[PDB]
Design a protein around this ligand. Structure first.
Ligand SMILES: [Mg+2]
Ligand SMILES: [Mg+2]
Ligand SMILES: [Mg+2]
Ligand SMILES: [Mg+2]
Ligand SMILES: [Mg+2]
Ligand SMILES: [Mg+2]
Ligand SMILES: [Mg+2]
Ligand SMILES: [Mg+2]
Ligand SMILES: [Mg+2]
Ligand SMILES: [Mg+2]
Ligand SMILES: [Mg+2]
Ligand SMILES: [Mg+2]
Ligand SMILES: [Mg+2]
Ligand SMILES: [Mg+2]
Ligand SMILES: [Mg+2]
Ligand SMILES: [Mg+2]
Ligand SMILES: [Mg+2]
Ligand SMILES: [Mg+2]
Ligand SMILES: [Mg+2]
Ligand SMILES: [Mg+2]
Ligand SMILES: [Mg+2]
Ligand SMILES: [Mg+2]
Ligand SMILES: [Mg+2]
Lengths: 59, 178, 141, 98, 78
RNA sequence: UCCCCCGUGCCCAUAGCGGCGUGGAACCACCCGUUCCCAUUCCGAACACGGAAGUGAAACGCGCCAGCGCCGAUGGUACUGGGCGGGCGACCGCCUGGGAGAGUAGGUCGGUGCGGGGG
RNA sequence: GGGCGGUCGCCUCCUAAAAGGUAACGGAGGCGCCCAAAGGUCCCCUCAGGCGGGACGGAAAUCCGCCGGAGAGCGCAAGG
RNA sequence: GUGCGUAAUAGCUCACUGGUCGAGUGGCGCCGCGCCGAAAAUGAUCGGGGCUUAAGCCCAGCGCCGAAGCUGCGGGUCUG
RNA sequence: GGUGGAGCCUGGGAGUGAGGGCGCGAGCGAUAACGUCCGCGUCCGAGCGCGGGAACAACCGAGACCGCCAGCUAAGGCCCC
């Protein structure tokens, strides 16, 4: 099963409540923060919404 | 007449139409195949090759498609075509709009109007063998008051007539005096 | 000038000027056309000043075609009046136009005279309005 | 385009349909929003009697005993094209009771 | 030179209050409507101001299909 | 295990409209009367009742005709969440998804349940 | 800005950004009522217009036939 | 009859063309950067000095500088 | 799916009810205002703590627990200050 890792490269300062309150769904809070993630379409659906703030790699 | 063709497989084509390659599609009864043609070839032949002429389309399968135009989408603040719908003709009396024109003295040339209502000569359906290139309409004496066309003397040679209406046709308008 | 004789309501809004054309690019009446390129308004004084500049220019032949109609009342308050207290009075009806819409269409005028006449009436308008001729770009099938 | 449509209300969800032709009558009992005819009794399909308004008593007893034979009691009655006059098909068994 | 007309009514605040796929009780208003945009189906009752409500409880369903108006169907659970 | 017709339905104009056929042994309609139960701001036209000698003209079903009407595909933009820029402004450009309304091809004059009658 | 003028409550449409709400001395209008029937139930009928006519008749009174599926009407402004 | 010139004349140049020459020549439709349009009140300037195959403008590429952001380490507090 | 200074219920306790800028959808204005009034979001207010934009709250990056003569970067630049 493919895993998922993102790195936050741009802060949600200047971005709406469905961005700053969308990074709380993943639990990352700062720049250069990364974590392994499941391949669920809910988390993917968050990833294409905050895709302009993080970089995406598949583990 | 004698225009090249290619294939499309669900591309970008807003990015493909930058170098003069506008997309297209052709059909007669089925096979809605997506193509793209060249803009200076299609524009250059499309200068004089109007709706009445059967524009034939070479294809990489070796077939020559007897197509025509359905619509040219104007770019509407750029005056350009986005997408041109081709129409292959098959063994069927297909619909044609032929740009007929007017010859002769319009209304006694000094006392002449404008005769501007061209309107692409509303509709004539035709078999693929009896399809015309030019049909002539004269304007022999048609002065300002009487002598209008009214599509009653609208019997073309052969195939076919106008199907339902007889109402849209050119007329004579007064000039603009000072 | 000219004005619509009947209205449902007297005053109305302004809105925006976005959108491409919403119809009015193919000529279909005359052999030439004065087509606009920038979004602005067309007052009835701009209609009259461009319409007189045709019939005074070319004579004895050529019917002029206008495809613009002012249905938008330009609302302006009187001078030296503070803000509020309702809308202003109606002075002249304006016509909203979009870029790439053909406004003025000459009829029965040749090339070297219609380029000149549309060039004279082009300076009466605050819009960059280029001149297009009768091409094969109709909407026929 | 004449129609009265007393069949449009349908508060009671189980009706007895009546058709009166100019020769004879026939009647059904329908179950609504399902489209299944449960029981019916038709003149000239069982050919009971010649006079058309004397049919209503024998088809009332016949459709009543076939309705109780099929075990349905709470029924209703339509009046689509026709007045409640002339033929009545009055009964005393089953919950129509008219 | 004054203001001719600057008053406006308070909104009565109509609208669809219970969409389909929602479990309801007996008595819930399915839609607050001005005119009868929705026609009663099974277990649906109208009132004075064309307001239709549920007669029983269950999963509600719309659009049995048209040609007479939009339909509301309070369907019971079995 | 099938065709025709009659009731009652679901699809909601691809079901209608207009024209051309066709059917009564078999239902249904038309018809002949009103004598009573019934009725009409007036009249058996529509409800109601005896029928049924004559009929399918009308209406009603089935079949045909695309023009009348309707439905209407692939592309192509308009538009727009979201992101990135330009213009002094009026307002535009790119990427990522989504994706119309007209118009064109084409389709249609029906599809499918339940219960009865006849062969 | 205050004064002068206008308004103070309720209803309808838009502004109002396709759930609801949403302002301005923003635009267009109404109300301080009325019906023993203009109410309930039951039973019949489908409107306004256009065409062909009439005995007066405005081109509108009343009558017949066809087309007309809701452009009439629903006490009162507007919406459904 | 292309423009003058004459009250009109006359006349000068011609649109059209013959050569001894000479290998390229005009009308356009887009497109990038430019020029004029562009004159206000204490001293002028893009931050300044300066900058022309750039120290501007368009498409690129490899590096570097660049925060109290993140990590390297130490210390304190709060919650679980 | 989502264990987060997330939510839900009760009780105690204040403050606020002059807001403003920016982008979009709008009205009035003149498609004028660093003009007035709404909505969708952000920021300032309360982050005049930091870097860039010469200087400047809302233009961009970034959310300052403290310390180090350590690195990597965001916006912006690499002729000299
Ligand atoms: Mg920011
Ligand atoms: Mg009917
Ligand atoms: Mg009725
Ligand atoms: Mg009836
Ligand atoms: Mg301006
Ligand atoms: Mg709303
Ligand atoms: Mg909204
Ligand atoms: Mg009533
Ligand atoms: Mg270089
Ligand atoms: Mg930190
Ligand atoms: Mg530490
Ligand atoms: Mg909190
Ligand atoms: Mg207050
Ligand atoms: Mg306040
Ligand atoms: Mg505010
Ligand atoms: Mg402000
Ligand atoms: Mg402003
Ligand atoms: Mg803050
Ligand atoms: Mg300071
Ligand atoms: Mg700074
Ligand atoms: Mg700050
Ligand atoms: Mg911190
Ligand atoms: Mg570095």
């Amino acid at each position: 099963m493919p895993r998922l890792k993102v790195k936050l490269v741009k802060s949600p300062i200047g971005y709406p409540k469905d961005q700053k309150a969308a990074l709380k769904a993943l639990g990352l809070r700062r720049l250069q923060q990364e974590r392994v993630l499941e391949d669920t379409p809910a988390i993917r659906g968050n990833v294409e919404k905050v895709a302009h703030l993080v970089r995406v790699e598949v583990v | 007449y004698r225009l090249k063709a290619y294939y499309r497989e669900g591309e970008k084509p807003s990015a493909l139409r930058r170098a003069g390659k506008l997309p297209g599609v052709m059909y007669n009864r089925h096979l809605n195949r997506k193509v793209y043609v060249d803009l200076v070839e299609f524009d250059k032949v499309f200068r004089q090759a109007s709706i009445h002429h059967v524009i034939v389309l070479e294809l990489p399968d070796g077939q020559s498609l007897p197509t025509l135009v359905r619509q040219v989408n104007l770019d509407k603040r750029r005056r350009r075509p986005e997408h041109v719908d081709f129409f292959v003709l098959s063994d069927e009396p297909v619909e044609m709009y032929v740009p007929l024109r007017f010859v002769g003295t319009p209304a006694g040339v000094r006392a002449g109007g404008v005769l501007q209502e061209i309107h692409r000569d509303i509709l004539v359906k035709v078999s693929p063998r009896n399809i015309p290139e030019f049909i002539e309409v004269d304007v022999s004496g048609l002065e300002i008051g009487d002598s209008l066309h009214a599509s009653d003397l609208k019997l073309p040679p052969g195939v076919e007539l106008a199907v339902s209406p007889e109402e849209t046709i050119a007329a004579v308008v007064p000039p603009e005096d000072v | 000038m000219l004005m619509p004789r009947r209205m449902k309501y007297r005053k109305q809004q302004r809105g925006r000027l976005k959108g491409a054309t919403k119809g009015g690019d193919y000529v279909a009446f005359g052999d030439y056309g004065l087509v606009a390129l920038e979004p602005a308004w067309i007052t009835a004084q701009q209609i009259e000043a461009a319409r007189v500049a045709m019939v005074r220019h070319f004579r004895r032949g050529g019917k002029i075609f206008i495809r613009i109609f002012p249905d938008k009342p330009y609302t302006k308050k009187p001078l030296e009046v503070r803000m509020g207290k309702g809308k202003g009075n109606v002075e002249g009806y304006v016509a909203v136009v979009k870029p790439g819409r053909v406004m003025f269409e000459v009829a029965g005028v040749t090339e070297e005279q219609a380029m000149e006449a549309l060039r004279i009436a082009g300076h009466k308008l605050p819009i960059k309005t280029k001149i297009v001729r009768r091409d094969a770009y109709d909407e026929a099938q | 385009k004449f129609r009265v449509r007393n069949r449009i209300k349908r508060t009671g969800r189980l009706r007895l349909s009546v058709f009166r032709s100019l020769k004879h009558i026939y009647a059904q009992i329908i179950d609504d929003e399902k489209g299944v005819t449960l029981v019916s009794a038709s003149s000239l399909a069982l050919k009971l009697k010649g006079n058309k308004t004397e049919v209503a008593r024998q088809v009332g007893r016949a459709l009543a005993e076939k309705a109780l034979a099929l075990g349905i009691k709470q029924v209703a009655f339509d009046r689509g094209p026709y007045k409640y006059h002339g033929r009545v098909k009055a009964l005393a068994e089953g919950a129509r009771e008219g | 030179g004054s203001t001719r007309n600057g008053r406006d009514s308070q909104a009565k605040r109509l609208g669809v209050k219970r969409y389909e796929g929602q479990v309801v009780r007996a008595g819930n208003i399915l839609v607050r409507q001005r005119g009868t945009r929705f026609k009663p189906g099974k277990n649906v009752g109208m009132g004075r101001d064309f307001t239709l409500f549920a007669l029983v409880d269950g999963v509600v369903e719309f659009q049995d299909r048209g040609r007479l108006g939009r339909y509301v169907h309070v369907r019971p659970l079995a």
